[PDB]
Amino acid sequence: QQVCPNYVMLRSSVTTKVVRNVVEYQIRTGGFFSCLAMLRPLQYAKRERLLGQRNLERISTRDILQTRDLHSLCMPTPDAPMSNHQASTMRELICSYFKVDHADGLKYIPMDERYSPSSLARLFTMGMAGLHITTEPSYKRVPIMHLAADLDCMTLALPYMITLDGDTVVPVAPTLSAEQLLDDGLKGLACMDISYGCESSRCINELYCEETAEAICVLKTCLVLNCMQFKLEMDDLAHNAAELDKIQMMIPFSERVFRMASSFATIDAQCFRFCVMMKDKNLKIDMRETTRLWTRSASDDSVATSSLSISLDRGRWVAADASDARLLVFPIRV
Amino acid sequence: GQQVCPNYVMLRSSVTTKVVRNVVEYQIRTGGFFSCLAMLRPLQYAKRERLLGQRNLERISTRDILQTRDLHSLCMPTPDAPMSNHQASTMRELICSYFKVDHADGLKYIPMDERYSPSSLARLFTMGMAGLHITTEPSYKRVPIMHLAADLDCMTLALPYMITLDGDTVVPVAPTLSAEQLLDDGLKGLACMDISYGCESSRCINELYCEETAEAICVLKTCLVLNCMQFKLEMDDLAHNAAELDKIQMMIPFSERVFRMASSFATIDAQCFRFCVMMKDKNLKIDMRETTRLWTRSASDDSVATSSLSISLDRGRWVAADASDARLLVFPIRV
């Protein structure tokens, strides 16, 4: 069974199975783990770089042109949620990294100023791996970022926000939203850090350098973009009876959505409050009830996060009150 | 464990004899060999070293001990280990061309002696393809990462071999020249070599040829040729090295390893071809001391008759066989 087929992150494939008169739900969320694998760019493109330029040509000529086809082309996706945040600065960021001009930079972000954040993230991630998806359906070779080769030995990644405790960098809880990091000239990304690991621990800002500075910022942006794509599909799924009613009584799907939102719970305030609530209800909530938690999570009043002191322990992001642990975030695979 | 050839790169080994049920069992480790062939996948060769900062090199350089293992890490000429003089002139100007570095300190890789360590050279060029330039001073400098090195980093198996034309059709041909004789004539003899990479998906390295990737193809082939030369140089020296050979003289398990090692270059080097052929004839049950007598005959065209041997490529394996018998089976190299 297909769940959310016209969606980049929420595209799923569930398989109901009856064994010994006990039902078992096995969920597959390939689009999500495909988009998070952008955190290791060389691995994201390691198989596609050998398919050849032919790959793109076949997708473009097909008349159906579904969202999965348009995502592979790093193009705006009709029939799927899109955004407008800092589209002006997003387009000139394409033109800066790829050294391409304005006229056909509009072909990624049109005059509508609407783009698919994950389709944008795919474009920039492939560029860091050395492949530039062009306006025409072609692969063009661009310089491979050193940072992308540095990080390709890592298997675990943990983004989080930081602040100063007096000459010491300490984790701070997400107060802004991920979208609000794309403005002010992307200068809000300096307060984000991804801790890569091999399970040895290496923070991405520890590797900061004049040579690697550009690669650091793009990689952070792609994570922010994948977070926006996630919010946009989570927001749209709520107002989508067609798909939500299909998974309405699949409680196993709540752990997956929680697992997914957990990825951004350290950098997005809405995903922070959303995951907190579901840990309170012990993650045993039917899908339809889950999205009311997603919809309340949009209000600063929904959970009391001010009294929550967070600490970083053994590659896990702990958010906990003195009484008990409220939320454990685990590093995302690849 | 017990150390074998500790002042060598490709042949550095560590053996541990263990007696179980009053039966002795030998466990052999040849780290230097599999470290040098891992250069066939450059990004993987440097995937762990790129995280260590330049301070690493300084710690090894400041040491006055200056052993061969230390000097290999510095991509420097190695005293106390065999070195070569073949096309040293063109090897140095190839350093200066790829790294855009000048002549004066290009001599510091290949001195006025014109002696160099082929594996130290292979390490220098392999690290460059992974984006890191080992400098004359102990420092890591960032150089453009070769696209080809990223292309090949999904592959797990590699099989070098020599090629020829069958009338508009590329066919495998047996090694008639030595690997060294592929570094001369401006390195134009490498156009007859091909490496079939695979994921066991099969991709020949010349299928990926392009103006953008042309340099990367040639450097990767050269490093394989260089690692083969390093192997010959240590194999030649081991024969006249009683100190080490007598320690492992009766270790028949060591014969499979040397055969497994020489098999890697048996497809592009004529000497390694005849050497591996011989040991397959004696069913690979040869004591180490006798093995290196076979290695010494292998240097002569007359030792085995290879002219009647038609070679073919079967499911990613290099078959050399005629009549009704498989004379040599070469398997793809891991990583």
Ligand SMILES: C[C@H](CCC(=O)NCC(=O)O)[C@H]1CC[C@H]2[C@@H]3[C@H](O)C[C@@H]4C[C@H](O)CC[C@]4(C)[C@H]3C[C@H](O)[C@]12C
């Ligand atoms: C954490 C502090 C700011 C003080 C603070 O805690 N405010 C949080 C807040 O903005 O609310 C910031 C400001 C200057 C930053 C550095 C500079 O921008 C330079 C450089 C930029 C790099 O993107 C990440 C490393 C770092 C050293 C940055 C680390 C860190 O990002 C710093 C040292």
Ligand SMILES: C[C@H](CCC(=O)NCC(=O)O)[C@H]1CC[C@H]2[C@@H]3[C@H](O)C[C@@H]4C[C@H](O)CC[C@]4(C)[C@H]3C[C@H](O)[C@]12C
């Ligand atoms: C932070 C990185 C890298 C900076 C650098 O080269 N190192 C400086 C250092 O190490 O001191 C830069 C590279 C190109 C920049 C972008 C481009 O110039 C285009 C555009 C320019 C605007 O003034 C600010 C937004 C932004 C998207 C820029 C954001 C950000 O400013 C980028 C993505």
Ligand SMILES: C[C@H](CCC(=O)NCC(=O)O)[C@H]1CC[C@H]2[C@@H]3[C@H](O)C[C@@H]4C[C@H](O)CC[C@]4(C)[C@H]3C[C@H](O)[C@]12C
């Ligand atoms: C095998 C044939 C030559 C016929 C032959 O067998 N003569 C051997 C001989 O020279 O004695 C050569 C000539 C043209 C070569 C190609 C061109 O030089 C272009 C290009 C050059 C690259 O170095 C390796 C790949 C290849 C496609 C080459 C593959 C292969 O190297 C070819 C197709």
Ligand SMILES: C[C@H](CCC(=O)NCC(=O)O)[C@H]1CC[C@H]2[C@@H]3[C@H](O)C[C@@H]4C[C@H](O)CC[C@]4(C)[C@H]3C[C@H](O)[C@]12C
């Ligand atoms: C074959 C490759 C790549 C050629 C290329 O850019 N593509 C051409 C194409 O695709 O037609 C070149 C790049 C630099 C060359 C070397 C440098 O020029 C230095 C030096 C120059 C000598 O004339 C011949 C030996 C060699 C080592 C050269 C061997 C070989 O000639 C190299 C290693």
